[PDB]
Nucleic acid binder design. Structure first.
Ligand SMILES: [K+]
Ligand SMILES: [Mg+2]
Ligand SMILES: [Mg+2]
Ligand SMILES: [Mg+2]
Ligand SMILES: [Mg+2]
Ligand SMILES: [Mg+2]
Ligand SMILES: [Mg+2]
Ligand SMILES: [Mg+2]
Length: 95
RNA sequence: UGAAAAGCCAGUGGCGCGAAGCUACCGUGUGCCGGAUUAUGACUGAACCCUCUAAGUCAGAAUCCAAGCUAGCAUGCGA
């Protein structure tokens, strides 16, 4: 069965400006800008604050669609920590 | 064929060598660049910490499609 409304929201810290333009998310911080297209997802992204929140919800979704809500949140969270702290992977030489 | 010289007949008289042309892995020369992917291994990532999968991505082949090569009266078309 389809739930009427499944929603998940998240915080957006200051010094980071998030822009939503028809499922295109741009995140800008000290380290630069990051962009993710989400037009493949079928949800709606609403800032619902002074740019300090972001709520993503699906209407009449099945269990597969609501799985995308947490996926989208974590992807957008990745853009925030990418432009505030960056990412670093350490590889080791084994021989 | 009177001899000699010069030939001719024996359906190519026979033998030796024989250019030209044709021709032999029996001789010589040449034979090919990009994209998408299979299998599989991975990235990120929920569902539900994890997870190559659900959404979204990567690498990938004597493979496929191109390119190249042959034709092109395709009742096609340009200058
Ligand atoms: K010859
Ligand atoms: Mg004589
Ligand atoms: Mg006679
Ligand atoms: Mg004889
Ligand atoms: Mg040969
Ligand atoms: Mg994983
Ligand atoms: Mg696969
Ligand atoms: Mg590839």
């Amino acid at each position: 069965m389809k739930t009427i409304l499944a929603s998940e929201t998240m915080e957006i810290p200051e010094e980071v400006t998030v822009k939503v333009s028809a499922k295109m998310i741009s995140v800008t911080g000290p380290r630069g800008t990051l962009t993710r297209n989400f037009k493949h997802l079928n949800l709606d992204f609403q800032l619902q604050e002074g740019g300090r929140k972001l709520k993503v919800d699906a209407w009449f979704g099945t269990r597969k669609t609501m799985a995308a809500i947490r996926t989208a949140i974590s992807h957008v969270q990745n853009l925030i920590t990418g432009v505030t702290k960056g990412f670093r992977y350490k590889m080791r030489f084994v021989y």
